[PDB]
């Protein structure tokens, strides 16, 4: 299946005193493998997965050097943006950045990305063709003109199609024991009487990986959304994910309902029906 590598960066200004809070995390698919927190004592890029600990000293020194350079750019950006939007220096603001690459099922470059946000809203993003920019407003337009003249897209395209893909493949191999393994959801159903004539059926999907999944309820072979509830997919905390979907039904009619589970770790979708 396809795979991806992504880096997330968040910088929060602190007008009261000192420098912005900077936090960066790296991910391969749904597995975090590195992080950097300006508030931490190491002041170094740190491992968050066993398979990346294999990397030698030159790796960590290079990554640390580069991530620090990123925080400084963000620090500068927070100031530049404050001016563009003509904002006070007393309020705290946020700059976020995300970039990375995807490899298709053929393990070749599929797509790349590089987007930026200010105070939780799109600011500027590299288009899919990795040659043009999408600017949300006139502040972002000035940035766009500057990056076009400096040919920033060309430099990024080189990384996204080359370096990015090359390292993603390296990580996929080094951590193949987990990164290239799918964990099928473990499923079961619970029953809870809410009244003398009504009962709730909850369909559970546990300890699965990756996070992508679909849970659907059917009544007599027909999809049902009325009287149902599905919670957002949530992390179990051990690297896997969880989710459930519930439906309220007439006591005694539980057998008409079936829960359908689709996940790439499943050869065919699962179908559950209450006892």
């Amino acid at each position: 299946g396809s795979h991806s590598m992504r880096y997330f960066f968040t910088s929060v200004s602190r007008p009261g005193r000192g420098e912005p809070r900077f936090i960066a995390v790296g991910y391969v698919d749904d597995t975090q493998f590195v992080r950097f927190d300006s508030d931490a004592a190491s002041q170094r890029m740190e491992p968050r997965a066993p398979w990346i600990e294999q990397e030698g000293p030159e790796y960590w020194d290079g990554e640390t050097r580069k991530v620090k350079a990123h925080s400084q750019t963000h620090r500068v950006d927070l100031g530049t943006l404050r001016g563009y939007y003509n904002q006070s220096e007393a309020g705290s603001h946020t700059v976020q950045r995300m970039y990375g690459c995807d490899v298709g099922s053929d393990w070749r470059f599929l797509r790349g990305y590089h987007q930026y946000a200010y105070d939780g809203k799109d600011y500027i993003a590299l288009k899919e063709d990795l040659r043009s920019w999408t600017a949300a407003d006139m502040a972002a337009q000035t940035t766009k003109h500057k990056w076009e003249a400096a040919h920033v897209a060309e430099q990024l395209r080189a990384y996204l199609e080359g370096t990015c893909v090359e390292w993603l493949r390296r990580y996929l191999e080094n951590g193949k024991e987990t990164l290239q393994r799918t964990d099928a959801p473990k499923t079961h159903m619970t029953h809870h009487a809410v009244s003398d004539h009504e009962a709730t059926l909850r369909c559970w999907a546990l300890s699965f990986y990756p996070a992508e999944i679909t849970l659907t309820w059917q009544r007599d072979g027909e999809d049902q959304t009325q009287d149902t509830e599905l919670v957002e997919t949530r992390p179990a905390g051990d690297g896997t994910f969880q989710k459930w979907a519930a439906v309220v039904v007439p006591s005694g009619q539980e057998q008409r309902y079936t829960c359908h589970v689709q996940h790439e770790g499943l050869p065919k979708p699962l179908t559950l029906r209450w006892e």
């Binding site: 580069k66 991530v67 990123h70 750019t73 950006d77 600011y123 940035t143 990056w147 430099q155 370096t163």
Partner: peptide, 9 residues
Amino acid sequence: SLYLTVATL
């Protein structure tokens, strides 16, 4: 592996 150069806004 992180990108090398980072252009400012």
